[PDB]
């Protein structure tokens, strides 16, 4: 398990605009936000950005 | 294996910190010295039924 603070989400968006860009076109459109972050932490994009 | 997340709007996180403080208090209570060790038991009554 990982704790995701709101300011952690804001700093993820600010430091990485790619995550906010993927957030804007998916979360209100296809799947909800916790599903989005569950998909993102299992993705190669997270490993590349880390 | 599986990944789980804790999405918070930074409002319940203060409550989570308070719960961690409660866990720390429980840790303090676990290592508490017994009352028969921190002070003498001579003046008190003898043990029994």
């Amino acid at each position: 398990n990982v704790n995701l603070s709101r300011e952690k989400i804001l700093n993820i968006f600010e430091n990485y605009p790619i995550v906010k860009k993927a957030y804007t076109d998916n979360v209100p459109k296809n799947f909800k936000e916790p599903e989005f972050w569950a998909r993102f932490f299992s993705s190669k994009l997270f490993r590349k950005l880390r | 294996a599986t990944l789980h997340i804790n999405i918070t709007t930074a409002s319940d996180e203060v409550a989570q910190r308070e719960l961690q403080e409660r866990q720390a208090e429980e840790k303090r209570k676990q290592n508490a010295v017994p009352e028969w060790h921190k002070q003498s038991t001579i003046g008190k009554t003898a043990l029994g039924r």
Binding site: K32, P34, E35, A38, R39 | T2, H4
Partner: peptide
Amino acid sequence: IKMTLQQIISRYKDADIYEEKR
């Protein structure tokens, strides 16, 4: 199949829990 299905049902369970809590 079981890792893919386990990942997607874990995601759906997390989504259901977080919609229930909100």
